[PDB]
């Protein structure tokens, strides 16, 4: 998910611009739901996932807000000490405590019913138990007990009119989420929200702790510890699920890291390229970043140095010259199925070969398979989420930086060989693989583009539409599931705010029993593909002016 927020000093023809692209995958019907709410203290417009009561993306005419995933470490695992005799009990603070338990019956259409028991300790539900060691593992969440309040903090924040009121609501959202702010006077802000544990000294948050008492959290850290910035010196706020701030530790996931190689750099250089930006330019960063190969900038210098003493007819060198001419922007050919330059296929095979010679070789089986993906893996339907830099590639980037990397290279991944020798071998593997399929003329190489599928199954793998309701778009775009832009104090209009968004395939999912499809079932789908957007209205006069229909209800509680 990404966001960029542009303040007073970087904005041109406005005082503040906020662009947001939350990335949850692509579905039919639409992941998010458009809705305006006017009354009872609320006056808001925007869109939000699963039509939650609180709007995750929108504004209320004075301030605007948006999110991206936080990925802090807010979950740890407690190894509970069981007993062979007195089962259902566990050791805690010197006594044998009884577990909570509940029985569940799963009814099955056209099958027999199944019943099982769920177990919970003071630390949380039991994930798994090791009968041999007599250990049960319990997953403990820092936000446990505050789910409902997080949802209400997302609803009440829609009424805030300033930083002070908005941060009061931010301090109650307990999940690990980044929150962003803009206002009518051109102020901008960011808070990495959520509840994070206050851990005992010596607790290494990447591995399990004993659940017998002494490793128990001390409580939760205060809100003053949560990374936050208001009106930054730079004039803008950008994020792509990268680190909030220096020294902040990330989720304990083995596949997730915040390293020197990070995709948010791609946003930074576009915002630092121009002294000020307009709204039209801030929208246009969506088009560039959507199409940018993310490994090029990282490994192009390494490839250039290694092939610098090669002759003109050495094919390993030709591969690097093709990359040196390329800006990294993918563009479809006229056939709608292949990319115009072969750069991403060359990096993909190179990187696969580099990881198999380096990172994978140092890791024992079967954990080596966690570090082999290049980051280009997909199927015919295309990526199910955003494109990122793989974990093997982030580790490899630190190793090719040499003593310029702050991470101690405890094992040399190049195993005694000079860097360049390993890079030339992988480049030979690349030339052999690709030339065999496409031939020796690099210039006529037509390599397969990634496509984009709006799926009928939801993110859990459960149908939320019939299979023929799936939609396909020719060009894969590394962008938000929806996009929305809010511009405050436009010098080009009399209106204090202007806002736009696009919710595809459309507002409605309705299909009548006769097969007739609602009028708003897919009228935003072509708009999505072309980088277009519709207006979000807030005021009564704008709503009345664009009204297509009206329904009035009379109800009494």
């Amino acid at each position: 998910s990404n966001m960029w927020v542009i303040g007073k000093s970087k904005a041109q023809d406005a005082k503040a611009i906020m662009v947001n692209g939350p990335q949850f995958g692509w579905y039919a019907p639409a992941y998010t739901y458009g809705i305006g709410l006017h009354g009872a203290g609320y006056d808001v417009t925007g869109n939000t996932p699963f039509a939650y009561p609180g709007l995750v993306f929108g504004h209320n005419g004075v301030i605007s807000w948006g999110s991206t995933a936080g990925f802090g470490d807010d979950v740890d695992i407690f190894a509970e000490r069981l007993s062979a005799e007195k089962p259902g009990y566990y050791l805690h603070n010197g006594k044998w405590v009884k577990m909570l338990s509940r029985e569940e019956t799963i009814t099955v259409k056209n099958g027999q019913a199944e019943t099982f028991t769920v177990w919970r300790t003071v630390h949380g539900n039991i994930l798994q138990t090791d009968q041999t060691t007599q250990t049960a593992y319990a997953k403990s969440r820092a936000w446990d007990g505050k789910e409902v309040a997080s949802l209400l903090a997302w609803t009440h924040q829609m009424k805030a009119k300033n930083w002070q009121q908005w941060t009061q609501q931010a301090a109650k959202q307990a999940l690990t989420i980044n929150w962003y702010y803009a206002d009518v006077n051109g102020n901008i802000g960011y808070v990495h929200t959520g509840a994070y544990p206050d851990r005992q000294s010596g607790h290494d948050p990447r591995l399990p702790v004993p659940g017998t008492g002494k490793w128990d959290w001390k409580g939760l850290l205060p809100f003053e510890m949560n990374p936050k910035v208001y009106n930054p010196q730079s004039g803008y706020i950008a994020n792509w699920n990268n680190s909030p701030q220096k020294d902040y530790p990330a989720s304990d996931l083995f596949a997730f890291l915040w390293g020197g190689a990070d995709r948010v750099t791609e946003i930074d250089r576009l915002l630092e390229q121009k002294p000020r930006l307009t709204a039209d330019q801030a929208w246009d960063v969506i088009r560039q970043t959507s199409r940018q190969d993310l490994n090029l900038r990282l490994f192009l210098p390494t490839l250039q140095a290694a092939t610098s003493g090669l002759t003109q007819s050495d094919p390993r060198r030709q591969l690097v010259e093709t990359l040196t001419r390329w800006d990294g922007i993918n563009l479809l050919n006229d056939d709608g199925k292949t990319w115009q330059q072969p750069g991403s296929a060359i990096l993909n095979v190179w990187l696969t070969s580099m990881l198999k010679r380096t990172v994978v070789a140092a890791v024992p089986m079967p954990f080596d398979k966690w570090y082999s993906a290049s980051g280009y893996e997909t199927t015919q339907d295309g990526p199910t989420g955003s494109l990122n830099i793989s974990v093997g590639a982030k580790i490899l980037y630190e190793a090719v930086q040499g003593d310029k990397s702050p991470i101690p290279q405890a094992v040399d991944l190049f195993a005694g060989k000079p860097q360049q020798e390993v890079v030339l071998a992988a480049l030979e593997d690349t030339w052999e693989t690709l030339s065999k399929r496409y031939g020796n003329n690099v210039s006529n190489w037509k390599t397969p583009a990634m496509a984009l599928t709006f799926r009928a199954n939801n993110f859990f793998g459960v149908p939320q539409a019939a299979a023929e309701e799936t939609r396909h778009q020719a060009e894969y775009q590394n962008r938000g599931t929806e996009n929305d832009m809010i511009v405050f104090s436009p010098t080009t209009s009399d209106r204090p705010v202007l806002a736009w968004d696009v919710v595809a395939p459309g507002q409605s999912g309705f299909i009548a029993p006769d097969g007739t499809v609602d009028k708003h079932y897919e009228d935003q789908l072509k708009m999505y593909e072309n980088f277009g957007r519709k207006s979000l209205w807030l005021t009564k006069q704008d709503v009345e002016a664009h009204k297509e229909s009206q329904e009035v209800l009379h109800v009494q509680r």
């Binding site: 807010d74 029993p513 009035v552």
Partner: protein, 206 residues
């Protein structure tokens, strides 16, 4: 009028709700949701509660068991029971507004039932506050804010200790899955502030 809910849809079909109190306002929101997204919302409801196998069968029994093992429903009902009347209105209004359209749908199904209910062979049921809260809890919390791999990390660490010895296996673990990396690009610049806590990176808990 306190009892009036006005719904204005724009040229893209986007609903705007005008009402005078909380319960009326969220009743209007729930009502247009049931109009626009009733089958999506009902499969989202069964997904977040682990009741998919009832309508879809045996292939979803492991899924349903996994959803149920990952939460504690009585703890969510206790949180709903502690809300103030104003806050509870948000949830109750939204479930009531959905129910109002579901009632019409189950009374006139020849014209109002979403085709997929026929296709999959079942009909919508009424919602309570617990179900509205579980839409948010089952997606945002229980999935997008629940990430850990501590048990798999431990097994990685143990395999690295066998390979390279005790001290060396820990240092390679720190190369592969560092705790922090001072050169990561950050949303907040270093001139503004840095995180104040320092953590143990030795697995000192064993």
């Amino acid at each position: 009028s306190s009892s009036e809910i006005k719904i204005v849809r724009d040229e893209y079909g986007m609903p705007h709700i005008y009402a005078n109190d909380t319960w009326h306002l969220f009743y209007g929101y729930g009502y247009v949701v049931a109009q626009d997204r009733l089958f999506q919302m009902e499969m989202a409801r069964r997904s977040t509660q682990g009741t998919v196998a009832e309508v879809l069968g045996k292939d979803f029994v492991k899924f349903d068991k996994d959803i149920r093992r990952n939460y504690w429903p009585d703890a969510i009902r206790a949180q709903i029971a502690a809300l103030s009347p104003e806050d509870m209105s948000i949830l109750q209004g939204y479930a009531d507004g959905m129910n109002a359209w579901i009632d019409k749908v189950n009374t006139n199904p020849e014209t109002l039932l979403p085709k997929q209910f026929n296709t999959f062979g079942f009909t919508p049921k009424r919602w309570e506050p617990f179900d509205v809260a579980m839409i948010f809890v089952g997606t945002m919390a229980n999935r997008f804010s629940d990430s850990t791999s501590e048990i798999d990390n431990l097994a990685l660490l143990t395999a690295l200790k066998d390979k390279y010895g005790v001290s060396q296996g820990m240092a390679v673990f720190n190369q592969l899955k560092w705790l922090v990396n001072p050169s990561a690009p950050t949303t907040i610049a270093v001139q503004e502030s840095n995180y104040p806590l320092k953590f143990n990176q030795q697995n000192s808990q064993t």
